Design a protein around this ligand. Structure first.
Ligand code: HEM
Ligand SMILES: CC(=O)Nc1cc2cccnc2c2ncccc12
Length: 106
């Protein structure tokens, strides 16, 4: 799918997680987020459309999703262990990465 749709998924499932009642819900939402981060990792954002795929900017962009997915995995680990509150905490930490990239390239 496309960037906007991916970012919607990221955003919706982040809310789902803040409101979550059980670990399956969280798991499920993180899994969806993961699939979206990996998709967005392939995209070229409007801001960077004139830039070489090679460029420091494009690499930085993709790296942000590498970090995001990494963190999502840490959150998934906790959710699989059924630590709901800790997984919710972890997902809140995601936001700094969302923001960091948004400032540069959104
Ligand atoms: C889980 C954390 C994140 C959340 C919750 C989030 C959410 C969003 C949302 C709601 C939008 C508005 C898009 C729209 O509907 O028009 C957006 C846009 C955008 N975000 Fe994220 N995002 C996250 C992580 C990231 C990361 C890590 C990057 C960079 C690596 C990034 C890059 C962008 C860019 C380039 C846009 C502009 C899209 C466009 O102009 O079409 N986001 N994001
Ligand atoms: C940020 C960066 O250096 N990107 C890439 C740079 C590349 C430079 C030569 C050949 N392939 C790539 C490449 N292939 C897949 C995905 C990313 C790259």
């Amino acid at each position: 799918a496309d960037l906007e749709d991916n970012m919607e998924t990221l955003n919706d499932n982040l809310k789902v997680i803040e409101k979550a009642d059980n670990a399956a819900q969280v798991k499920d939402a993180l899994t969806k987020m993961r699939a979206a981060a990996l998709d967005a990792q392939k995209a070229t954002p409007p801001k960077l459309e004139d830039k070489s795929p090679d460029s420091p900017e494009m690499c930085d962009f993709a790296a942000g999703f590498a970090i995001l997915v990494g963190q999502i995995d840490d959150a998934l680990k906790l959710a699989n262990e059924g630590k709901v509150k800790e997984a919710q905490a972890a997902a809140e930490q995601l936001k700094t990465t969302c923001n960091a990239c948004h400032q540069k390239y959104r």
